[PDB]
User: Which sequence fits this backbone?
RNA sequence: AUAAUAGUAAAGAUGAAAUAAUAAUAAUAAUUAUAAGACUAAUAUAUGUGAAAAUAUUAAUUAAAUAUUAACUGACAUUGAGGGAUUAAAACUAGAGUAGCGAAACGGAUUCGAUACCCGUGUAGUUCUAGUAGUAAACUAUGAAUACAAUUAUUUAUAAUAUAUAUAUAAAUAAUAAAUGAAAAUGAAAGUAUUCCACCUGAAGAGUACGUUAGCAAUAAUGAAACUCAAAACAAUAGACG
């Protein structure tokens, strides 16, 4: 009670999660956008969409594998194009 | 007065070059921009919910080995320590 | 074998925060002892608001007094200790994890092991200095 | 012997080093050895590397890490040009205390730590070129890069108008500075002081 | 750590290499009208200081406005960058 | 050939329909005391 | 023993911005400088209350209310135009005296709008009194299963 | 039996090794320039417990069945060996597989649906037999000696 | 789902709509609060671990599974007819449970028709417990074992070095050489060889009939012939087509 009324709600001075982005008043877009980042960086949004229709476990595993493969080629492609750019720059 | 994204501020310690003093350079740098990573049984920290709090997307989520980039064993033991810490009251 | 119990006890004494915690620390102990087994290292971890409001016995404990006891007993006594714990209304979220000593004759508490240490005999000469 | 020949090969005279050719890390000491080529070889497009350097390169100085690599090319950056910074240190004419030179001027089984001037200086500390040095012009960072070496600008009185005169082009503007002195922290980093004549 | 060699491909071209060109400048102008017409009503007493812009955007050309060279760079620097074994 | 395998499917399904009709005859007077 | 003592604290504007409809709900916390004027409850008790102060919906609003009906209740116009009403109402009911937090939930086309509307012009007089934005999308950790895949 | 322990720790060696400390402690002080006071009994009480704990912390009644087995295989090898050391003799190998075959079995007599470890028990049995079959093809005398010895 | 609460008129679903016990009994949304079940995000590559089924929420116990030396054993093996053991999803027999899902069912859509796709309820079942049964594209469509053969890059295990380096080993994964191959392609095997087991000998009829065994049953295994054709199948190619 009193002993903790002083407790500045110690609790809520760092109590919640990352699902929050205090707004620096003034700029509002940025703040709202700051959430767009967290949201789009904890994949929260996309997961909701997935957790809508559950495919057979083998089917979802296959999909996951395919996604992984796609990811790995994209960064393999990126690596290749960076080398190509370097070669262009140098003279090769 | 000027914006940040346009003015390298090499510390004096370094070796500034004629190009180094250029925008190209600024762009270049951007492009090319951990006691656990050191080698301590990440599982031993099965409690200390402080240490584990680090490699965490701050959403009760561990990270793919694209960010954490910890050793397979280190990351898996860190993940196990986080999961074990969930069992160990704190975190 | 060597076990560990990072249990989180509840508190009610606006006054003493380590009342029950200590009282339970006695209980568990008394029994870890009267049964062939050595208590080893106790490392009061004090208090830390629980990340979530952990409702125990419909009390919704938003905080708990973490504590740790490094002990050693047969499976049964170790198993039995689990039973005691969950079934102790005071404790809120218990846990006994193993500490195999196959390699190191004496193992420290998980905590010190992440502090760089590894053994009590080590952690003792670590303080021995004085006399 | 084949090996004897290679053991003296200029290719091996150059040690190996896989340090990145971008090194975004703060730089104090050089990372690789520049390969100098006589203008002749440049037209002959010869650089002594595993593969010939592309005509696109028109410098006579390049730095290489991989004679050749899986990508079927040599990993080199034709931007090797430290030749300028170190020479400018000579253009600046200032010696380094180098802590205490017990017996040997640089003093010190292996002198890995406190390597010394680091080949940035091989001249007697005291000389009369000091005659108040030679107020070498430097590019004020706010600190002032003199001859590729930043030196903290010092002055009898703070002159804001001087900074206002160059506005945001303080680094673009170059002011002569009577270098107070420089020093090589064991991490091979030179710390120096400038004399803003404003 | 970083490392991801690819498998041989017909060619490592790039899809629609996105060079980036601003959205029909007019499209932004017409949009702001409806970004200041939703409120304040049609031809907002404020939008006078707006339609002034969407005027000539049309006029002669109702649509004020009715590349890249990486594919060859790729075609030429792939049979070199790809770490294919010998043959 | 998958199409050929699918035909088995049509044939097994057809036989399953016959089995259902045969199932009526099964467990009946024929399979009891006879 | 005291009697109710209510001094609303912050104001909460919440919404479930789903695909087929968008909802906005303005609520107000509630409090009392009395809970602790009683020695019967233990110290813990009080914080529990504080940690989770009560709450009262003050302006339930859904796209359809503003006019749209059926499919349309899922588009953008709806939200942009079913937000203003919400805000406009926070004004008339004289509810802008203390801070307000936002909690965009789910991701129907409406979320963006209610976020445009807050920032742009119709949010103006309100935005100002908003503290921290946030979010409460509900994702499940396995949990229960979800519809088969509509072979749409 | 009571007082047994792990990793070669016969209680006697403990009694004699623990004892070494007694001799050492006192004799450390005999020399130098420090006198003898509380060390008249060095807390017989404290040392008595020290050893005691050691015993609880090294008592098979408080260790792991695996450890009891580590002891056993030895016992058997040493009852079936051909000479000090031999650990490859068919009977030694058989005897060793025997100890386990039991453990494994009592294990299965609880986890009746554990099948993988059931495959194990069997493979072993099939295996012991295979080596036992070899010894009856070699030192036949030994074979029968051994089998009747192990109980088959 | 269920009250508590305050709030108002729609809610919800779809291509768009209908309905149902949706909501003027005050709904949905909100926020608290009880109860009941299933499941287990990231990490997470099924990397891996398992004989194969399978298998990534946490811990406890039990058990198996590693490398390298060292001591021993002394060919004790290679794998195998038959047999035995395990064996996904569905199904079944008991007993409990039953949130969500969802055969069947019934209703609403759409459509020319719609016993479908779409949508609303939603029962057998999906869960556990003890069983039973023994089949899957149980697929790497590739039986097991041993000896051997040309490179590279990554994992990575691991010894070593004068750990943090560049080295020697293995192991896996990815590109290939040779070789093989109807080609697709295989790549330390689909190569070079040796050993052992299983199985095939045109298509239909047919894994059907019948007999026999096993099962509570559905069924599972075993498994013919007559009749009729000069067909039937696969990889590579053009071309037409979507």
Assistant:
């Amino acid at each position: 009670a009193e002993i903790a009324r002083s407790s500045v709600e110690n609790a809520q001075m760092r109590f919640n999660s990352g699902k929050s982005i205090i707004v620096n008043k003034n700029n509002p877009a940025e703040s709202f956008k700051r959430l767009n980042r967290i949201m789009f960086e904890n994949n929260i949004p996309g997961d909701k969409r997935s957790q809508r229709f559950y495919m057979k476990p083998g089917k979802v595993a296959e999909l996951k594998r395919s996604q992984r493969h796609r990811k790995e080629f994209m960064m393999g492609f990126k690596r290749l194009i960076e080398i190509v750019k370097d070669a262009k720059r140098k003279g090769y | 007065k000027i914006d940040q994204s346009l003015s390298k501020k090499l510390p004096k310690g370094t070796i500034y070059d004629p190009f180094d003093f250029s925008m190209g350079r600024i762009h270049l740098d951007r492009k090319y921009q951990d006691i656990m990573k050191s080698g301590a049984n990440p599982l031993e920290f099965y409690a200390r919910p402080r240490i584990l709090s680090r490699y965490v997307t701050s959403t009760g989520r561990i990270q793919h080995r694209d960010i954490t980039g910890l050793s397979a064993k280190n990351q898996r033991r860190l993940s196990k320590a986080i999961r074990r810490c969930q069992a160990i009251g704190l975190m | 074998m060597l076990y560990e119990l990072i249990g989180l006890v509840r508190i009610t004494n606006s006054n003493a925060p380590k009342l029950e915690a200590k009282e339970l620390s006695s209980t568990i102990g008394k029994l870890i002892i009267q049964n062939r087994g050595v208590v080893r290292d106790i490392v009061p971890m004090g208090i830390r608001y629980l990340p979530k409001i952990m409702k125990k016995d419909q009390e919704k404990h938003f905080r708990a007094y973490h504590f740790l006891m490094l002990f050693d007993s047969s499976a049964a006594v170790q198993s039995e200790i689990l039973r005691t714990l969950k079934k102790d209304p005071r404790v809120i979220r218990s846990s006994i994890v193993k500490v195999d000593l196959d390699k190191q004759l004496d193992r420290a508490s998980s905590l010190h092991r992440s502090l760089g240490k590894k053994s009590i005999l080590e952690l003792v000469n670590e303080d021995y200095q004085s006399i | 012997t084949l090996a004897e020949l290679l053991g003296r090969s200029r290719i091996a005279q150059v040690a190996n080093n896989h340090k990145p050719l971008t090194y975004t890390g703060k730089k104090f000491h050089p990372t690789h050895q520049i390969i100098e080529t006589k203008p002749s070889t440049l037209y002959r497009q010869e650089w002594g590397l595993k593969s010939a350097i592309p005509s696109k390169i028109k410098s006579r100085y390049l730095v290489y890490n991989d004679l050749d690599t899986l990508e079927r090319i040599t990993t080199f950056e034709p931007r090797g040009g430290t030749q300028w910074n170190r020479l400018r240190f000579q253009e600046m004419g200032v010696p380094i205390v180098s802590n205490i030179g017990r017996q040997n001027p640089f003093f010190k089984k292996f002198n890995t730590e406190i390597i010394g001037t680091g080949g940035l200086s091989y001249s007697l500390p005291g000389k009369l070129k000091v005659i108040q040095r030679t107020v070498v012009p430097g590019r004020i960072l706010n600190l002032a890069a003199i001859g590729g070496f930043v030196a903290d600008v010092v002055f009898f009185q703070s002159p804001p108008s001087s900074f206002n005169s160059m506005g945001d082009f303080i680094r673009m503007k170059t002011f002569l500075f009577e270098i107070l002195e420089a020093s090589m922290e064991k991490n091979g980093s030179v710390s120096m002081h400038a004399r803003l004549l404003e | 750590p970083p490392v991801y060699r690819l498998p041989p491909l017909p060619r490592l071209k790039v899809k629609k290499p996105i060079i980036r060109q601003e959205a029909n400048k007019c499209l932004v102008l017409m949009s702001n009208l409806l970004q200041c017409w939703s409120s304040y009503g049609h031809m907002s007493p404020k939008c006078a200081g707006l339609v002034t812009e969407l005027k000539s955007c049309t006029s002669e050309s109702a649509l004020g406005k009715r590349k890249s060279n990486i594919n060859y760079h790729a075609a030429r620097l792939y049979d070199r960058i790809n770490g294919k074994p010998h043959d | 050939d998958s199409v050929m395998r699918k035909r088995k499917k049509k044939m097994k399904k057809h036989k399953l329909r016959k089995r259902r009709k045969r199932e009526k005859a099964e467990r009946r007077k024929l399979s009891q005391g006879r | 023993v005291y009697k109710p003592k209510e001094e609303v604290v912050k104001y909460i504007l919440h919404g479930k911005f789903t695909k087929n409809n968008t909802h906005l709900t303005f609520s107000s916390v509630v409090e009392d400088k009395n809970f602790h004027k009683n020695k019967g409850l233990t110290y813990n008790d009080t914080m529990l209350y504080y940690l989770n102060l009560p709450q009262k919906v003050k302006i339930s609003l859904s796209t359809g209310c503003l006019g749209f009906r059926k499919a349309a209740r899922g588009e953008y116009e709806a939200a942009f135009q079913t937000s203003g009403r919400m805000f406009e109402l926070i004004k008339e009911k004289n509810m802008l005296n203390k801070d307000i937090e936002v909690v965009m939930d789910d991701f129907g086309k409406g979320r963006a709008a209610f976020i445009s509307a807050l920032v742009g012009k119709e949010g103006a007089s309100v935005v100002k009194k908003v503290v921290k934005i946030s979010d409460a999308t509900k994702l499940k950790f396995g949990g229960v299963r979800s519809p088969k895949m509509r072979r749409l | 039996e009571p007082l047994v322990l792990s990793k070669g720790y016969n209680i006697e060696e403990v009694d004699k090794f623990l004892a070494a400390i007694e001799s050492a402690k006192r004799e450390r002080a005999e020399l130098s320039g420090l006198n003898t006071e509380v060390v008249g009994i060095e807390d017989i009480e404290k040392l008595e417990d020290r050893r005691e704990a050691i015993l609880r912390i090294l008592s098979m009644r408080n260790s792991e069945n695996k450890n009891a087995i580590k002891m056993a295989v030895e016992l058997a090898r040493k009852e079936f060996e051909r000479f000090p050391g031999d650990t490859g003799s068919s009977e030694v190998q058989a005897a060793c597989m025997t100890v386990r075959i039991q453990n494994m079995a009592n294990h299965i007599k609880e986890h009746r649906k554990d099948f993988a470890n059931t495959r194990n028990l069997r493979i072993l049995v099939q295996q012991r037999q295979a080596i036992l079959r070899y010894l009856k093809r070699d030192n036949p005398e030994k074979y029968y000696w051994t089998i009747q010895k192990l109980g088959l």
Summary: Chain B is about 35% helix and 0% strand. The helical segments of chain B are 23-31, 35-39, 49-52, 72-87. Residues 56-57, 59-65, 68, 72, 75-76, 78-80, 82-84, 86-88 of chain B lie near RNA strand I (CB under 10 Å from a C1').
